[PDB]
Amino acid sequence: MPPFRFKAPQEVRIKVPIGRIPPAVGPEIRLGKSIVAVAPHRVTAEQLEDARRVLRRVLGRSKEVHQNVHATYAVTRKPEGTKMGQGKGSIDRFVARVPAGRILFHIPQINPFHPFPEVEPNFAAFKAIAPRLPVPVVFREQNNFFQMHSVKDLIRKRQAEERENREKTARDKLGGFH
Amino acid sequence: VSIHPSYFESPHPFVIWEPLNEAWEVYFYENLKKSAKPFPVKKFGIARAKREALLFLEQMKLEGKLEKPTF
Amino acid sequence: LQIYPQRRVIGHRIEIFRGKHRRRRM
Amino acid sequence: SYRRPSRASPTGQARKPHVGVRRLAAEYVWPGVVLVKQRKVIAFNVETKRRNRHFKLYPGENVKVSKVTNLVALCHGRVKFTHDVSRDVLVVNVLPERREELLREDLWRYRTEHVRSMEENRHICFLRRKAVRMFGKELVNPPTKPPLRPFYFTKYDSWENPALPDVPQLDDDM
Amino acid sequence: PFKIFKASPPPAPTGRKPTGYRGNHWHKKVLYDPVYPTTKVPAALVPRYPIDWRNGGRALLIAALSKLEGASALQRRIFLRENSRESQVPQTPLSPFQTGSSASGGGAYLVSSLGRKRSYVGRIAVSLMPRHRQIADYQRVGGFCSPRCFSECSKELRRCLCAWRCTGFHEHVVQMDGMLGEYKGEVKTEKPLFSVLRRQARRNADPSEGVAFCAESAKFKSVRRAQHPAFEAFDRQGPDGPSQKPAPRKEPPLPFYSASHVPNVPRPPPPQPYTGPLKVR
Amino acid sequence: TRYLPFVPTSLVHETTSFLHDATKLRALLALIFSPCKPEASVADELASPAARLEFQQEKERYHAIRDQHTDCYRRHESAAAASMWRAIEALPSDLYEEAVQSVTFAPPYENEPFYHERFAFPRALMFHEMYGEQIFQSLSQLERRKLQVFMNLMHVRYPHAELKRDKPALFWLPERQVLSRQR
Amino acid sequence: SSAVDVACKPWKRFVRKEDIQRAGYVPCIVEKYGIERRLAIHRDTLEALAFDEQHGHLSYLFQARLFRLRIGNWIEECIPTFVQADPVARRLYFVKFERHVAGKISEVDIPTTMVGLLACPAYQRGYHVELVMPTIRCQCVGAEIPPPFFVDVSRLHYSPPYTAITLQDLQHLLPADGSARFHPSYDAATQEVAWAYEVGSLPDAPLPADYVDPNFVDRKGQKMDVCFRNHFPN
RNA sequence: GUUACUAAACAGGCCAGGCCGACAAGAAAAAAAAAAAAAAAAAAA
RNA sequence: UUCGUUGACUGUGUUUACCACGGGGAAUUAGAACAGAAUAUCAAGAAAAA
RNA sequence: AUAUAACGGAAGGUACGCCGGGGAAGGUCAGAUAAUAUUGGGAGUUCUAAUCCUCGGAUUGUAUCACUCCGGCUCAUUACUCCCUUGUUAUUGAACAAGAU
């Protein structure tokens, strides 16, 4: 129940079919900032590790980043010294079979600047890593801030009340109406 | 679904609600023996299964197959 | 392993007839 | 250095198991007809498998179990299937009847149904059965010609040849 | 000492016929499945250690002790157990003859023995303890008074006095103590059984409610708070309605993604029967 | 480490010598298979017609009287059991769990590295303890010899009844030292 | 509180989901405690509530609001219970509502909100403050649904190994009339709604036994056969 | 009435081809007990 | 029970599930009949006044 | 009892060869790889873009590696601001000169 640093799933050293990447059951929602795949693809362990290192370097030691998927699915390739048709090749790499709509990385820190709605999110690390992923990506930020708590609505209502009051005083002072 | 409890009440002793199969079973006598024909909800729907069971009961009554064989 | 029948249609309802394509009874 | 499996070409397995039912519902059968083919060999992690072969069916009314666990008929009748909710298995029964026309109004007797116990399975078989041996019934369009010829003579005989003479049917009540 | 880091003993090697090496003979079905027959292991192939003083001499000593105590005591204990398990309600007195008019039977053991045509010689054969488990059980509960004293007498040196002179009122005391001291809950085993299962007590429907006095009204009132009637019904009778959402997650959301919607096995096993206590009418 | 139960020969020297001595083995076997009269030939009789007729008459009388006597106890026990089960059924569901646990109940053991106290049967409640002196004073000569032999064989079977209580640690040894011993 | 009145039009007798979708609407079915009633809701209006965060996907408030759909002369007071929406795009495909009736338990996952993070001592000291539980399960029997739960962190100081705001702290936010409560299965004293801890200091834990590797799932929603091998490390 | 057969590739791997005249065929009969304790005998008939 | 036993029989009858054929042989029926021999198991035991 | 376990039941060479029949440098593919920029990183006193090295993804492309009857000479044809020659005055870590992209 306390916070923990769960160990990563291990690499399965079992030959498996190339197969197809099944679709996502539904939207994946996580508070904070998320980088979400937009098309299906299989991301290599090297690519995931590079993205993690870049995210850590950009954000800093004081901030924590969660890698949502892991490369456990084996993928094989033949040695150049083997002829055609002599069975499947040796394991060559490991991949995560990311569908469309799957979060790759996310940071759970909520945006503190609720009263500054015009300051839109900082996606610096996501921008740094996106052009290197083999998947198109979309940047998301969800902070559980609902419009019922919006401060801009109160600001607008106050401005409207002030305007109405000003027009009322101007009319009264000029005295063209009862 | 939402259904009134009076649906499962049968108006005749030979018409029974079987809840395992959710079917209306109608009893009758044929060839000096006792038989039961089921009318499933999965087949007819909620109201129509009961309606068809009642119609089959009337058919068996006309055929005289509701009478107890005697030896 | 089972092949599952396709239920919704793409176009028109299928219709089967005897014999090869030709002008036939109408 | 690739180890070619023994079951590679040309020495693969010629004949497949073909495990499963061999007669559908409402079909007419006589003693000795194999209703379901099954095998004794069992997989080593059966509870994790998903193919339908590994999960056998169960005998019911007028059905025996063979040496290799095939389900075979024991009386002249029509096939029926049942689902055992308690054990979550399929049960094969044969309702005894003499050969006669299979009418549309009688097809409900061979529906697959859910039961909780084999006692209820027997009760349902009695309730759907057409008639009892000691009382019989009026046969509706029963066959009157001799049976199909032996397979080794002709595989494609004709059923109820009008040119053949009527012969008594005195075997389908046993 | 008494407290120790005990090692789990290695399983005993069940033998097997040297055949059928390509098949799985260890399906989890119940004897005697019509379509999943179980392969037998001949008793001549079960690996057993050579007989020495640890397994043979001990049996000889226990057999000598039983001989001294008399096979009649063992016969009487077995008869009393069998009659007690079947006479847990008031019976009418039963005579062994149609016209005796004076002789009484001594238990429903009579009815069972007559119905099964049980072997008078067989009872003596059982009491003579020809089997390893029988001798092991006598070494553990061999005392005549076991229904009341359990294994406490397993090492007592004047134990034969019970067998020699525990009769009549003392036998009645043993039985009455045993009836109160015996277990009456659910037995939980995966091993095969073929005898009439021992009784499990039925459980009453209602629970007990705690009540404390309140002088503001001079009356006793329930300790538990009020809550909404719907909440009370949910807490008492269960989830209510035929369908509800699953239990909410009680652990912090995992940082990694896992396919938690996937069922454990492609084809789930059949439902398990309720072995617990039944309700009271 | 983790230990396994064991009983070394040194701590049980007495029973090993008892069972390895030929004469003591012969005496024990004779006691087990007493009497030792032959039973193969047709002419082997350990009794006589009149003797076994009188024995049968006495046995039949004894069994008849015992069945006539103990039947009242059996009926009373049946009624008592009925009452006990009725009371258990009448108990509330909260107390049901405790009311079916038997005297010897104890929570499950944990191999770490309504239950107030352990179950202990008062030794003063054992039948032979309560009436030991009277029965002993009323025994016969053969019964006294039987009691002596029963004692001696009990001691032979359990030379270490007190030693196990005193030093239970002597009967538990590590796996790596126990499993490596031949039978 | 967060109840929303909405206007709908009929899902007519031969139209399909795809037709209503291409007509610029979302197909919805209201069920439970009455007849199954079909309707269509203007997609812009519905998606405004469903995706009320400019950079966010489906909002936890969607399945926790009380909708007041109006069809013809009827008013359906219900809650969204099933939502088919696009994994990537902010598109609503299909909706299934279940009616809410005063007196019967409705199982609603009411969301949590931390608007006062700038007043948190732990956050100002540079430590990581996390909202662990986006929603809290509640059993509601009243005529209204509780609004989102405000988690106040102005007194959340950091002490090793971590500090937590648990459900007992929020217990005071429930209605005074007792029309709503936290799920009884919750242990209020140990169910943590918020954490404050230091990055890089957490203890190690093994992967949960209920973990299912998403790389070995077939298109049918079943585990691949390789997951049952003796050598499968996960 | 009624949804069940079905492993092609030098595809991803398995194989022990054997036992029993009987506690291994087998009539009748019998058959494996929660927790804890005792015993340290791999033990249901 | 520490219980018997040898049907792990001798023959007559061309009918039967499956199907390229062969090996009715992954291993089907009481072909419910007939001529011999053998092994195990029976059933019944109802009626206890005032 | 018997061998058929190849389980419907074990000598080699021919570049001296012969007869009958049939034919693999392309066409195609795009793994490495080539071009272009781009992302991350490392060099360049300081400096991510004067300039250099390397990594991932993207588009385009086929120099090298993984369907017939080598090299040189002679004569050549076409593409690429391309090796020298041009853009006074692009940029330069461009004083000039010699240079670099």
Ligand code: FES
């Ligand atoms: S045997 Fe224990 S008191 Fe009698």
